[PDB]
């Protein structure tokens, strides 16, 4: 009994590749398309809710997740791997930051902690790498809005806009033609919906699309009043109805 696997399962091949990382990236390639776009006054992250059966309640499966009140995550690749990474990311935001400084971590640093967790699954004994690429969108007072990609290796890059998964090559090209540094948040949501339609096969509506924003503070989502400096989460998930509204003016 107990782990006899105290040795690495990811190792360098003679050509210098790390096989398991490459293969994890291949699993991400098969994954459903997800994307992020950075506007001047906000960020949008979006993905298709590829449903497994029509008997499944796809609302119960949320691909876009709140990590902190100002940071959200989406992914492409293996769903179960993503789910546990969200659990760990939420916790590490507290244990390694909020319980120390009494405030939530800035986007880059929470991203840095997730990247660390994913890197250790590439070197530690008896584990495989995570089979997901993450897109993390957030806001913090001193850096403003930001968008990050985190890959199986633990590498992360800041983006203006990008896509990952199935039709990422086509989607990145579409985003290069459309992105400028003057985009307002509502313009970015519009571009995100256009981009996603190219990669979505079947129905394209607010029940098959998942989309969240990092934007203005939402005092109506705070749950209490009386502390002026507490203004509410900047993360908001758009409802099924709110998405359909934007799809008529498409």
């Amino acid at each position: 009994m107990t782990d006899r696997y105290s040795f690495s399962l990811t190792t360098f091949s003679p050509s210098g590749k790390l096989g398991q990382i490459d293969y994890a990236l291949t699993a991400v390639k098969q994954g459903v398309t997800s994307l992020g776009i950075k506007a001047t006054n906000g960020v949008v992250i979006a993905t298709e809710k590829k449903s497994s059966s029509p008997l499944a309640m796809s609302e119960t499966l949320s691909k876009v997740s709140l990590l902190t009140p100002d940071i959200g995550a989406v992914y492409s690749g293996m769903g179960p791997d993503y789910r546990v990474l969200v659990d760990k990311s939420r916790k590490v935001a507290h244990t390694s930051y909020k319980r120390i400084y009494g405030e939530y971590p800035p986007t880059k640093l929470l991203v840095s902690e997730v990247a660390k967790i994913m890197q250790e699954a590439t070197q530690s004994g008896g584990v495989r790498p995570f089979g997901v690429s993450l897109l993390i969108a957030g806001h913090d007072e001193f850096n403003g809005f930001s968008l990050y990609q985190v890959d199986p290796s633990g590498s992360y890059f800041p983006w203006k806009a990008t896509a990952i998964g199935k039709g990422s090559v086509a989607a990145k090209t579409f985003l290069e033609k459309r992105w400028n540094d003057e985009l307002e948040l509502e313009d970015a949501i519009h571009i995100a919906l256009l981009t996603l339609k190219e990669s979505v096969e079947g129905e394209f509506n607010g029940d098959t699309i998942e989309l969240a924003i990092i934007g203005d503070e939402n005092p109506d989502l705070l749950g209490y009043t009386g502390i002026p400096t507490d203004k509410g989460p900047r993360f908001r998930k758009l409802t099924s109805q709110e998405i359909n509204d934007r799809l008529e003016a498409l």
Binding site: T2, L9, Q30, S53, P80, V127
Partner: protein, 241 residues
């Protein structure tokens, strides 16, 4: 080809041990089905007792996890009981730690997390089982949540599992296309059970006696399994129709 013996990625990004654990799921050759009423959640599973020497009362793939949660398993019984004991322990610990009964979906997520770990950690094999959790949750109402060896889980309007799962799934799909609603529009759990058995018969094209089935029912504040006589009573009502 050691990438097929343990849970590491193959060159095409697959986990063969997870895939082979899925094939173990059908090894018992048993089909299960779950639906929701207004007030209840019903789960039915085939009961096959091939050996005459068995005590048929001990042959079961349905488990009472907590007072409110039931679970049916598709897969070998040793792995099934492993999952059942852990789920019971987890549900009991949750209540002690947090002061309220563990919700069906939260237990499903927890078991799915444990399963995910076996797909990432080398020394633990995946369990060759699919776990369907059912309850009448105090917040969410009648609930079906299902877990697999990949560590995936999701909620369902209704669901089916086993070798002939596709037939039952399309049968249930077609009914809800017609009915236009998320559940069986029926007051009594007795009639929801009757619906469940009726649609299993049609989908599988087989008749059932009282010993060919196994039934679990979830209502507000309790999950319970039916006796052969309760099921016989139910089969009779289906026939007189």
């Amino acid at each position: 080809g050691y990438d097929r013996h343990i849970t590491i990625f193959s060159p095409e990004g697959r986990l063969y041990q997870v895939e082979y654990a899925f094939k173990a799921t059908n090894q018992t050759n048993i089909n299960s089905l779950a639906v929701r009423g207004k007030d209840c959640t019903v789960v039915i599973s085939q009961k096959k007792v091939p050996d005459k020497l068995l005590d048929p009362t001990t042959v079961s793939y349905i488990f009472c996890i907590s007072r409110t949660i039931g679970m049916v398993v598709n897969g070998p019984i040793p792995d099934a009981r492993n999952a059942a004991l852990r789920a019971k322990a987890e549900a009991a610990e949750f209540r002690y730690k947090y002061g309220y009964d563990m919700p069906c979906d939260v237990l499903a997520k927890r078991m799915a997390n444990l399963s995910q770990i076996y797909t990432q950690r080398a020394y633990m094999r995946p369990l060759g089982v699919i776990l369907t959790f059912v309850s009448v949750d105090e917040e969410l109402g009648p609930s079906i949540y299902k877990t697999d060896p990949a560590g995936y889980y999701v909620g369902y309007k209704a669901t089916a599992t086993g070798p002939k799962q596709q037939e039952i799934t399309t049968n249930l799909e077609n009914h809800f296309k017609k009915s236009k609603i998320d559940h069986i529009n029926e007051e009594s759990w007795e009639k929801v059970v009757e619906f469940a058995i009726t649609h299993m018969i049609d989908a599988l094209g087989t008749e059932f006696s009282k010993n060919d089935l196994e039934v679990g029912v979830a209502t507000k504040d309790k999950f319970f399994t039916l006796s052969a006589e309760n099921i016989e009573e139910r089969l009779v009502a289906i026939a007189e129709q």
